[PDB]
Amino acid sequence: CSNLSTCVLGKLSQELHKLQTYLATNTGSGTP
Known part of the structure; x- marks a missing residue:
């Protein structure tokens, strides 16, 4: 990761x- 901000942005992604x-998952199997 290039910097602390991009590392956090990666984790948040x-x-x-x-x-x-x-x-x-909930729409395809978790409810039907």
Whole structure:
């Protein structure tokens, strides 16, 4: 990672990806 800010932005991207995965999983299998 280039700096502390981009390292945090990378981690936040992975946290955002986790919530997106949760939404997709819950709609595709977690509820139906």
